[PDB]
Amino acid sequence: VLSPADKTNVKAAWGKVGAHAGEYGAEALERMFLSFPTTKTYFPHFDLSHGSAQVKGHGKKVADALTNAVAHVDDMPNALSALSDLHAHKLRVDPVNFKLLSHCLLVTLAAHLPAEFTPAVHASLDKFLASVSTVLTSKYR
Amino acid sequence: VLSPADKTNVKAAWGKVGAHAGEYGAEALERMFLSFPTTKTYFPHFDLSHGSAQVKGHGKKVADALTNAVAHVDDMPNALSALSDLHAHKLRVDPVNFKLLSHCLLVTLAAHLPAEFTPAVHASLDKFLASVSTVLTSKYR
Amino acid sequence: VHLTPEEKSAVTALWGKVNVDEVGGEALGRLLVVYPWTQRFFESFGDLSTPDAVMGNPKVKAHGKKVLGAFSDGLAHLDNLKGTFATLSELHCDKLHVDPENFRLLGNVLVCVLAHHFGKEFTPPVQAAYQKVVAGVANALAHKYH
Amino acid sequence: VHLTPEEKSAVTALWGKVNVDEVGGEALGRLLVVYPWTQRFFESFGDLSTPDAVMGNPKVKAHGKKVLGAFSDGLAHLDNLKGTFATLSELHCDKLHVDPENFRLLGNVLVCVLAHHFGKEFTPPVQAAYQKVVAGVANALAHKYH
Ligand code: HEM
Ligand code: HEM
Ligand code: HEM
Ligand code: HEM
């Protein structure tokens, strides 16, 4: 649902992330592949070693797909409408993995913004990624 | 999201349930309390013995809250808008329990309609309860 | 798996009148149909375009047939579900990489197939009994993830 | 819990510089705030109306303080997380009735508190290590549910 107070914290926290967005977008991926080994069965044609310019490049896709959400928050089911078919229809990505990611994505932000990662923004972020995850899985519902 | 083909199976399967709706609505509850003991921590002031007229009475609430969804399917977030505050705000019902129920609700229907519980309607029903569960938890998002 | 004598009988009595051949594919089939992403592990089976194609693919009613075995097997070794599944745990984990959350989905679709095939005979207490078993099984295969 | 020597050091080195008093309430606190339904178990603690009230309630920084203990405890008994938590498993299950899915939520919010308090020192490999531990712990308490 996301409330105006939530919108403000997401737009607030994402702003303070800015420039490093892509960087951060590839740090969450590595954390995932490492902590949740089972999520690699999707990136074979990928190099998942610490330096993969493929992971760095992908982190930019995810990061900007998210920045695409924060800016159009009131309307994700349409902006993301497309990434919905690809993850659900073509890829068949298990819904659990959207939880494993979102976690690593909150474990990344806290390790870069120890000032504004207040219990509140933390909750706001968790709701935001919760809404993104829902929309990308929606094509299953 | 629910597709026209899905809508048809939900409206189809629910029609064939009709009159017994309330009955069925109290058989899923007992199945839950039994199979998932942990879900009772919500009904203390309730009698959960096999005959409880309290469980029978509640099964009518749930059953008709659902019939309220199938008829207004294209608009659940508004019809159910109310049951959203009560389950999320006042009650604080853990989101996992909405999964435990929905399961028992599909294990009930199959034991009463062995004709139309085709792999397809089964999938359609699972998507429908998946959408109801999402809306009642939405007040958390 | 505790299974008090009451439960022990419910699971045995029922399980004994089970079409061990057909029931096995009935589950696997509905899994790929109701939880599409799971088809991501059986692409070598054939056409899984429609439910009708899935509910007929011979590769499926042959695999579900082997799945049901492991159950009758575990069901005859409750006192030790860990030892019996040691092999299959290494297979589904360090080779197939299926997520343990999908062993719960299969155990439940199974409970729905049994509820469908035995209708009323499938009383709540009979379910709460099988649910325990399924759960116990879903924890053995997931064991190697430690 | 396997913890290869690499991991064994990552978890020890870090865990050693942890504010065992403050860090403990930091987690419990954020749990009730981020997963509201969980407040349903700590209504005897006080005002949990706003996050500020939760992040100050003395009842909370005292309970989180005891929670963190069990960890340092389990962390010093990896070879056996089952035995050590036998008591707490009976408590949280056949008395409190918390669902095992909520022990995973707490183990993760903890990983987020450690990621926040040690920022960069908290490298991915250090996480993938702690994640294993948390998981191993979330399976002991959930043990009595069989
Ligand atoms: C927060 C949720 C996520 C977002 C925002 C996201 C976003 C994206 C975007 C924008 C693309 C790339 C489109 C392109 O460059 O052509 C993509 C592709 C893909 N995503 Fe995700 N994704 C997310 C989660 C997941 C998860 C959880 C998995 C798997 C565990 C996954 C698997 C993939 C795969 C397989 C591709 C294709 C990449 C390739 O093989 O080249 N995604 N995703
Ligand atoms: C399919 C989802 C469900 C539906 C459609 C549903 C529907 C309802 C409805 C219509 C009411 C009654 C309103 C009234 O009579 O005043 C209600 C109340 C309630 N529901 Fe649900 N419910 C569902 C799932 C759950 C779950 C999963 C739990 C707990 C495990 C739960 C716990 C309660 C409680 C505590 C009440 C108040 C009953 C009382 O204490 O008197 N509900 N629900
Ligand atoms: C209730 C738990 C399950 C049981 C009892 C079970 C049992 C089995 C057995 C017995 C085999 C083959 C052994 C043999 O060929 O000798 C097998 C293979 C396999 N299982 Fe499972 N399984 C379970 C759940 C799952 C789930 C949830 C998936 C996920 C989609 C899955 C995916 C696989 C795959 C892909 C194979 C086929 C491997 C091959 O081609 O031989 N299984 N399983
Ligand atoms: C990581 C897993 C967890 C650990 C290590 C843990 C540990 C503990 C400990 C040590 C106690 C008190 C023991 C004593 O007073 O001597 C306790 C009590 C309790 N736990 Fe947990 N717990 C865990 C997760 C949870 C979760 C997820 C909830 C759910 C909200 C929860 C709810 C309770 C409650 C309500 C009590 C308070 C009981 C009282 O008033 O004494 N715990 N827990």
CSV table of N, CA, C and O and ligand atoms in Angstrom, one decimal, chain D residues 28 31-32 37-45 63 65-71 85 88 91-92 96 98-107 110 134 137-138 141, ligand 4:
chain,number,residue,atom,x,y,z
D,28,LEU,N,15.8,-6.9,18.7
D,28,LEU,CA,14.4,-7.1,19.2
D,28,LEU,C,13.6,-5.9,18.9
D,28,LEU,O,12.4,-6.0,18.4
D,31,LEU,N,12.5,-5.5,15.3
D,31,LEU,CA,11.6,-6.6,14.9
D,31,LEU,C,10.2,-6.3,15.1
D,31,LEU,O,9.3,-6.5,14.2
D,32,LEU,N,9.8,-5.7,16.3
D,32,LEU,CA,8.5,-5.3,16.7
D,32,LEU,C,8.0,-4.1,15.8
D,32,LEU,O,6.8,-3.9,15.6
D,37,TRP,N,3.2,-7.5,13.7
D,37,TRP,CA,2.5,-8.6,14.3
D,37,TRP,C,3.2,-9.2,15.5
D,37,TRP,O,2.6,-9.7,16.4
D,38,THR,N,4.5,-9.2,15.5
D,38,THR,CA,5.3,-9.7,16.5
D,38,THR,C,5.2,-9.0,17.9
D,38,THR,O,5.5,-9.6,18.9
D,39,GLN,N,4.6,-7.8,17.9
D,39,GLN,CA,4.4,-7.1,19.1
D,39,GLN,C,3.3,-7.8,19.9
D,39,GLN,O,3.2,-7.6,21.1
D,40,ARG,N,2.7,-8.7,19.2
D,40,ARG,CA,1.6,-9.5,19.8
D,40,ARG,C,2.1,-10.4,20.9
D,40,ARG,O,1.4,-11.2,21.5
D,41,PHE,N,3.4,-10.4,21.1
D,41,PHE,CA,4.0,-11.3,22.2
D,41,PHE,C,4.6,-10.5,23.3
D,41,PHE,O,5.1,-11.0,24.3
D,42,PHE,N,4.7,-9.2,23.1
D,42,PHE,CA,5.3,-8.3,24.1
D,42,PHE,C,4.4,-7.2,24.4
D,42,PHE,O,4.8,-6.0,24.3
D,43,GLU,N,3.2,-7.5,24.8
D,43,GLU,CA,2.2,-6.4,25.2
D,43,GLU,C,2.4,-6.0,26.6
D,43,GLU,O,1.9,-5.0,27.1
D,44,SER,N,3.2,-6.8,27.4
D,44,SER,CA,3.4,-6.5,28.8
D,44,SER,C,4.7,-5.6,28.9
D,44,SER,O,5.1,-5.4,30.1
D,45,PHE,N,5.2,-5.2,27.8
D,45,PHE,CA,6.4,-4.4,27.9
D,45,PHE,C,6.1,-2.9,28.0
D,45,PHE,O,6.9,-2.1,28.5
D,63,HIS,N,15.3,-7.6,27.3
D,63,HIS,CA,14.9,-8.9,26.7
D,63,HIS,C,15.9,-9.2,25.6
D,63,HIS,O,16.3,-10.3,25.4
D,65,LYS,N,18.7,-8.2,25.4
D,65,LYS,CA,20.0,-8.4,26.1
D,65,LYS,C,20.1,-9.9,26.5
D,65,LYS,O,21.2,-10.5,26.4
D,66,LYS,N,19.0,-10.6,26.8
D,66,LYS,CA,19.0,-12.0,27.1
D,66,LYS,C,19.0,-12.9,25.9
D,66,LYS,O,19.5,-14.0,25.9
D,67,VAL,N,18.4,-12.3,24.8
D,67,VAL,CA,18.3,-13.1,23.5
D,67,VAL,C,19.8,-13.2,23.0
D,67,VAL,O,20.2,-14.4,22.8
D,68,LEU,N,20.5,-12.1,22.9
D,68,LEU,CA,21.9,-12.1,22.4
D,68,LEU,C,22.7,-13.1,23.2
D,68,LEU,O,23.7,-13.7,22.6
D,69,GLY,N,22.4,-13.4,24.5
D,69,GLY,CA,23.1,-14.3,25.3
D,69,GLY,C,23.1,-15.7,24.6
D,69,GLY,O,24.1,-16.3,24.3
D,70,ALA,N,21.9,-16.2,24.5
D,70,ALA,CA,21.6,-17.5,23.9
D,70,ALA,C,22.5,-17.7,22.6
D,70,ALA,O,22.8,-18.8,22.3
D,71,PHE,N,22.7,-16.6,21.9
D,71,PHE,CA,23.5,-16.7,20.7
D,71,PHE,C,25.0,-16.9,21.0
D,71,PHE,O,25.6,-17.8,20.4
D,85,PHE,N,19.6,-25.7,22.9
D,85,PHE,CA,18.3,-25.0,22.8
D,85,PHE,C,17.0,-25.8,23.2
D,85,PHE,O,15.9,-25.3,23.1
D,88,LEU,N,14.7,-23.8,25.5
D,88,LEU,CA,14.0,-22.7,24.8
D,88,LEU,C,13.1,-23.1,23.7
D,88,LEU,O,12.2,-22.4,23.4
D,91,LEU,N,9.9,-24.0,25.4
D,91,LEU,CA,9.3,-22.7,25.8
D,91,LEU,C,8.6,-21.9,24.7
D,91,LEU,O,7.4,-21.6,24.8
D,92,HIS,N,9.3,-21.6,23.6
D,92,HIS,CA,8.7,-20.9,22.5
D,92,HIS,C,7.7,-21.7,21.7
D,92,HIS,O,6.9,-21.1,20.9
D,96,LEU,N,4.6,-20.6,24.2
D,96,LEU,CA,4.5,-19.3,23.5
D,96,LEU,C,3.8,-19.4,22.2
D,96,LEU,O,3.1,-18.5,21.7
D,98,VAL,N,5.1,-19.4,19.2
D,98,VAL,CA,5.6,-18.6,18.1
D,98,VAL,C,5.8,-19.5,16.9
D,98,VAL,O,6.2,-20.7,17.1
D,99,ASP,N,5.6,-19.0,15.7
D,99,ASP,CA,5.7,-19.8,14.5
D,99,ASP,C,7.2,-19.8,14.1
D,99,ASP,O,7.8,-18.7,14.1
D,100,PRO,N,7.8,-21.0,13.8
D,100,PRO,CA,9.2,-21.0,13.4
D,100,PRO,C,9.7,-20.1,12.3
D,100,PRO,O,10.9,-19.8,12.1
D,101,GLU,N,8.8,-19.6,11.5
D,101,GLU,CA,9.1,-18.6,10.4
D,101,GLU,C,9.5,-17.3,11.0
D,101,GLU,O,10.1,-16.5,10.2
D,102,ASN,N,9.2,-17.0,12.2
D,102,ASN,CA,9.6,-15.8,12.9
D,102,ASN,C,10.9,-15.8,13.6
D,102,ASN,O,11.4,-14.8,14.1
D,103,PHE,N,11.6,-17.0,13.5
D,103,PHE,CA,12.9,-17.1,14.1
D,103,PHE,C,13.9,-16.7,13.0
D,103,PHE,O,15.1,-16.4,13.3
D,104,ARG,N,13.4,-16.8,11.8
D,104,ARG,CA,14.2,-16.5,10.6
D,104,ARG,C,14.2,-14.9,10.5
D,104,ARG,O,15.2,-14.3,10.1
D,105,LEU,N,13.1,-14.3,10.8
D,105,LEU,CA,12.9,-12.9,10.7
D,105,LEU,C,13.9,-12.2,11.7
D,105,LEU,O,14.5,-11.2,11.3
D,106,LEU,N,14.0,-12.8,12.9
D,106,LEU,CA,14.8,-12.2,13.9
D,106,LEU,C,16.3,-12.4,13.6
D,106,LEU,O,17.1,-11.6,13.9
D,107,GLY,N,16.7,-13.6,13.0
D,107,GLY,CA,18.0,-13.8,12.7
D,107,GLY,C,18.6,-12.9,11.6
D,107,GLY,O,19.7,-12.6,11.6
D,110,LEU,N,18.9,-9.3,12.8
D,110,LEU,CA,20.2,-9.3,13.5
D,110,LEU,C,21.3,-9.0,12.6
D,110,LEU,O,22.2,-8.2,12.8
D,134,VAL,N,22.8,-18.2,11.9
D,134,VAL,CA,21.5,-17.8,12.2
D,134,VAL,C,20.5,-19.0,11.9
D,134,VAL,O,19.7,-19.4,12.7
D,137,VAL,N,20.6,-21.8,14.1
D,137,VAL,CA,19.9,-21.5,15.4
D,137,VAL,C,18.4,-21.5,15.2
D,137,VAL,O,17.7,-22.0,16.1
D,138,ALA,N,17.9,-21.0,14.1
D,138,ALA,CA,16.5,-21.0,13.8
D,138,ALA,C,15.9,-22.4,13.6
D,138,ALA,O,14.7,-22.6,13.6
D,141,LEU,N,15.5,-24.1,17.8
D,141,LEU,CA,14.2,-23.7,18.5
D,141,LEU,C,13.0,-24.3,17.8
D,141,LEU,O,12.0,-24.7,18.5
E,4,HEM,C1,16.6,-16.1,17.4
E,4,HEM,C2,15.7,-16.8,18.2
E,4,HEM,C3,15.4,-16.4,19.5
E,4,HEM,C4,16.1,-16.5,20.6
E,4,HEM,C5,17.6,-16.6,20.7
E,4,HEM,C6,15.2,-16.3,21.7
E,4,HEM,C7,15.6,-16.4,23.1
E,4,HEM,C8,14.7,-16.1,24.1
E,4,HEM,C9,15.1,-16.2,25.5
E,4,HEM,C10,16.5,-16.4,26.1
E,4,HEM,C11,14.0,-16.0,26.2
E,4,HEM,C12,13.9,-15.8,27.7
E,4,HEM,C13,14.6,-16.8,28.6
E,4,HEM,C14,14.7,-16.3,30.1
E,4,HEM,O1,13.9,-15.4,30.4
E,4,HEM,O2,15.4,-16.9,30.9
E,4,HEM,C15,12.9,-15.8,25.3
E,4,HEM,C16,11.6,-15.5,25.7
E,4,HEM,C17,10.6,-15.1,24.8
E,4,HEM,N1,10.7,-15.2,23.4
E,4,HEM,FE1,12.3,-15.7,22.4
E,4,HEM,N2,13.9,-16.0,21.3
E,4,HEM,C18,14.0,-16.1,19.9
E,4,HEM,C19,13.0,-15.6,19.1
E,4,HEM,C20,11.8,-15.2,19.4
E,4,HEM,C21,10.7,-14.7,18.5
E,4,HEM,C22,10.8,-14.7,17.0
E,4,HEM,C23,9.7,-14.4,19.2
E,4,HEM,C24,8.5,-14.0,18.7
E,4,HEM,C25,7.9,-12.7,18.9
E,4,HEM,C26,10.0,-14.6,20.6
E,4,HEM,C27,9.2,-14.5,21.7
E,4,HEM,C28,9.5,-14.7,23.0
E,4,HEM,C29,8.7,-14.3,24.1
E,4,HEM,C30,7.3,-13.7,24.0
E,4,HEM,C31,9.4,-14.4,25.2
E,4,HEM,C32,9.2,-13.7,26.4
E,4,HEM,C33,8.9,-14.7,27.5
E,4,HEM,C34,8.9,-14.0,28.9
E,4,HEM,O3,8.2,-13.1,29.1
E,4,HEM,O4,9.8,-14.5,29.7
E,4,HEM,N3,11.3,-15.1,20.7
E,4,HEM,N4,13.4,-15.9,24.0
